Design a protein around this ligand. Sequence first.
Ligand SMILES: Cc1c(C(=O)C2=C(O)CCCC2=O)ccc2c1c(=O)n(CCCc1ccccc1)c(=O)n2C
Ligand SMILES: Cc1c(C(=O)C2=C(O)CCCC2=O)ccc2c1c(=O)n(CCCc1ccccc1)c(=O)n2C
Ligand SMILES: [Co+2]
Ligand SMILES: [Co+2]
Lengths: 380, 380
Amino acid sequence: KNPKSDKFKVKRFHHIEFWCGDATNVARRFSWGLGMRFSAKSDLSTGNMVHASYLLTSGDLRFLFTAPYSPSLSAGEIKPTTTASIPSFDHGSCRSFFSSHGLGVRAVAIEVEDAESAFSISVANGAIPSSPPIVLNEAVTIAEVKLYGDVVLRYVSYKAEFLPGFERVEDASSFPLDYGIRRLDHAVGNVPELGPALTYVAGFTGFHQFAEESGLNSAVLASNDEMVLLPINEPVHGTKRKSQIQTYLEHNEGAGLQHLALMSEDIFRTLREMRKRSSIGGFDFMPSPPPTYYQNLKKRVGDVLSDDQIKECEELGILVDRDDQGTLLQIFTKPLGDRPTIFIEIIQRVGCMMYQSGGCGGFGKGNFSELFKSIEEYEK
Amino acid sequence: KNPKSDKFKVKRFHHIEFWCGDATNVARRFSWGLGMRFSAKSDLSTGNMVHASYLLTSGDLRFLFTAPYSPSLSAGEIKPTTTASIPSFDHGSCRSFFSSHGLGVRAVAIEVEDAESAFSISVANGAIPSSPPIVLNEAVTIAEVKLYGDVVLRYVSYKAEFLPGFERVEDASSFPLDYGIRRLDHAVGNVPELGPALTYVAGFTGFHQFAEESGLNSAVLASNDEMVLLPINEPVHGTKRKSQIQTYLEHNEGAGLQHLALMSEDIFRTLREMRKRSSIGGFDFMPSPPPTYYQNLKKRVGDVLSDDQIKECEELGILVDRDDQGTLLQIFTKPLGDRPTIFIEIIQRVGCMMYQSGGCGGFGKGNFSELFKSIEEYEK
Ligand SMILES: Cc1c(C(=O)C2=C(O)CCCC2=O)ccc2c1c(=O)n(CCCc1ccccc1)c(=O)n2C
Ligand SMILES: Cc1c(C(=O)C2=C(O)CCCC2=O)ccc2c1c(=O)n(CCCc1ccccc1)c(=O)n2C
Ligand SMILES: [Co+2]
Ligand SMILES: [Co+2]
């Protein structure tokens, strides 16, 4: 049952913005590790005396990396006279965010038909304002409201290239890397209490709960066409193994974005390319499941994957689960930075063709039981 | 005239420590861009609840990357009970340093015979204490005094593997990258006033001035065997082109480390390997000199370099200058991070063999005039 109760019209995920200490070094690491191209910049070379912001792209996926300059560079400025290309940026907010949480996602940005209306409707329906709507160069409107912890849901709307004031990067600096990642599938938050978080967000968006003992309870909020998916996790305290959600909240200093799930058009090639680079500047992956997990894969997905495609999953460490509607291939990186907080999931879905409907195959929660069983069975 | 007036005994450069927001992402970028191996770590996996520190090595060059965790992780700790592996670390000092300067060098570490004595003698001779001597595991002594701005000269001494509490990285995580960089040749500071900076540092070290209109005045302080070299720059105000030193001080919020010069055993291979990676996560280089610069190279270094070796300099953008004692090959990267502050120089020296004596060939100040002339001559 999808009641299609969105209180405004939302199209798709637009971009994810990381707040960093040095946007240059994070963006270069991410670009090599994930195969994303340098697409746009807004910094001193473009006249921005406030923040440095570098955009990476792969397919429709857009990662923005932003860090503050010395406030002394822009001391004569006031908001009306700002050189910032993102008007919601604030030196003090960014330094406090990064000091408190370390490297992580500040904004989950979705594209809307009209950012002003979406902001107005949101706050009228309980959203806590963060940045009022601002129209940039009579071309793009952006607005922000609180999502959970210190993360904002950013609304972006275009009348008719990323943002005004950003410049497209010179080809010489822009090497056409691509490992097959194509778009953002879902973005997941960790909170101390799931219930109030769900009521708050679903309260101001109209998003509905998407149809779905290992450290968490979870639920998924979705847009009308279920292309925007926002799962939220809480910890289950009192187990024997400590909750990974609780560990997150402790090292993150509270609620925040846990993982970004990036859809690949060819997960086998994406994982081959990322695993080649794991020890030369890229991203590490979580430990692989035992061969027991893959021997048991034939009995569950042997209808969808060949034996050659299943052993290819085994050499790459890919996990597989299944809904009644589709099949899911997934794998998780190790944490993206110093703290055991944010990580990335690489994903590709098969089935539910009509295009492919969103969430086809679920989110892989059945892989918790399958991994534990496979692990214990492997031991004995 | 080398009066050999060192007030204690110093061996060589030991390591350079960067203070970062996220030590993981800076270290991975540097490792790929410069060809340095992950050699040691001190972080949560080693029991350090205070800071994350990752060591990269190439030859005798050691780069340390350190960032603070949430103070909440170590709130019950006091200095006697600390889990920090570097006892001079302080959450507040590091966050304030990085907020003020951005990514840059906190410590220039030199190896001494006895760090306690070197600290005592230094402060008795005018040095401003920063961190008193501390003996780690009855094995290593470290101490720190102020050098310029917020950079410290760190003394390290070993009775008889980087530091106690650091672990050697698992081979699987440690990919044997190497582009030919072998050691730190010199480390350069930018200050507002050269005179007082020189008197202060030479005052407490006993270092002597090493034998030597484009934006700076400079002078070089050296150890007894002239293996430790510490040039210092000041701006020359009132030119037509603005001083790069003054631009540094403005964006850095005052005095600090301008560049690190890394000696290569094969600069041609180092530059080939680094230039291959410039647009895929590595380091960019300053613009190359015009062909005019290289046509004029034959008349000045045609005795030392073949025509094949000279055109190889031309394809890599390498600069060449000469003392009366030796010849210098050098090239400069673009800034290492967001701000136009710190950069890196790659260097290789030829001549003055006895081993090679330090500073053989100078520091390339004659390349300021040669580049300008070559540039103007190229135009017309
Ligand atoms: C995150 C995830 C998902 C996932 O994507 C997902 C959502 O999209 C929405 C609904 C809830 C949810 O969980 C699916 C399966 C997963 C994991 C996962 O993290 N781990 C590793 C667990 C060890 C661990 C150690 C340390 C820190 C974190 C974790 C798994 O083993 N499985 C099977
Ligand atoms: C730094 C250097 C050295 C050098 O190493 C050195 C020392 O070791 C010690 C003594 C003084 C000194 O200068 C030598 C030659 C150099 C440069 C250099 O920076 N530039 C680029 C200038 C444009 C520029 C733009 C923006 C920001 C900075 C600079 C050059 O053109 N030349 C020829
Ligand atoms: Co997921
Ligand atoms: Co130099």
